Design a protein around this ligand. Structure first.
Ligand SMILES: O=C(N[C@H]1COC(=O)[C@@H](NC(=O)c2cccc(O)c2O)COC(=O)[C@@H](NC(=O)c2cccc(O)c2O)COC1=O)c1cccc(O)c1O
Ligand SMILES: CCCCC/C=C\C/C=C\C/C=C\C/C=C\CCCC(=O)O
Ligand SMILES: [Ga+3]
Length: 157
């Protein structure tokens, strides 16, 4: 409540560019199109967020809950989904950059994701985005920009 900005962007979050090094995912992120999502505040230490990705091979839409989210200041952690996301940069004015990391048994992973407040991409959104990726010594092929092309979409259900 003390952050009306959240309510402003909450309801629809767009993913239009990512960064990674794991070929399996990087290999595929390069083929998908822009994705959408909806986030809700359950509690500062818990929030509900949904993922919407249009996959021509088979669109996939679902919901997910984030629990025990207060570790490093404001970060989300799902004991079940063994995956956490920390607000690495968010303005909802034109873009937001977040640090996403998935850790499997014996394997750890990190990746950056660039969001857009509007289906369009601001040259600055891609640049600030690249700046961070560079700090991680990333290369173009490691970061793939995604178009607005849409085949499937989610509802305000
Ligand atoms: O390493 C990560 N994925 C793997 C492994 O995850 C998976 O294979 C599946 N996935 C989940 O079950 C999942 C369950 C719970 C939460 C999930 O996000 C799942 O994805 C399906 O996702 C996909 O096929 C693709 N995925 C998106 O397009 C996406 C688009 C926008 C937003 C997405 O989350 C997407 O996954 C590719 O994802 C992958 O290859 C990975 C890391 C860090 C953060 C991630 O989100 C990752 O997914
Ligand atoms: C918003 C989560 C969307 C989840 C589904 C889409 C992509 C999954 C990967 C990263 C998205 C996770 C969080 C979005 C970034 C910052 C949230 C700030 C919330 C706030 O400022 O209070
Ligand atoms: Ga995922």
């Amino acid at each position: 409540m003390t952050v009306p900005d959240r309510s402003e962007i909450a309801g629809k979050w767009y993913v239009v560019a990512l960064a990674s090094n794991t070929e399996f995912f990087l290999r595929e992120k390069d083929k998908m199109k822009m994705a959408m999502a909806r986030i809700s505040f359950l509690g500062e230490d818990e929030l509900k967020v949904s993922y919407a990705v249009p996959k021509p091979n088979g669109c996939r839409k679902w919901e997910t809950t984030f629990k025990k989210t207060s570790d490093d200041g404001e970060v989300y952690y799902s004991e079940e989904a063994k995956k956490k996301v920390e607000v690495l940069d968010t303005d909802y004015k034109s873009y937001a950059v977040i640090y996403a990391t998935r850790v499997k048994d014996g394997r750890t992973l990190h990746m950056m994701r660039l969001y857009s407040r509007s289906p369009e991409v601001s040259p600055a959104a891609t640049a600030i985005f690249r700046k961070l990726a560079g700090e991680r010594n990333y290369t173009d092929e490691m970061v793939a920009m995604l178009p607005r092309q849409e085949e499937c979409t989610v509802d305000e259900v």
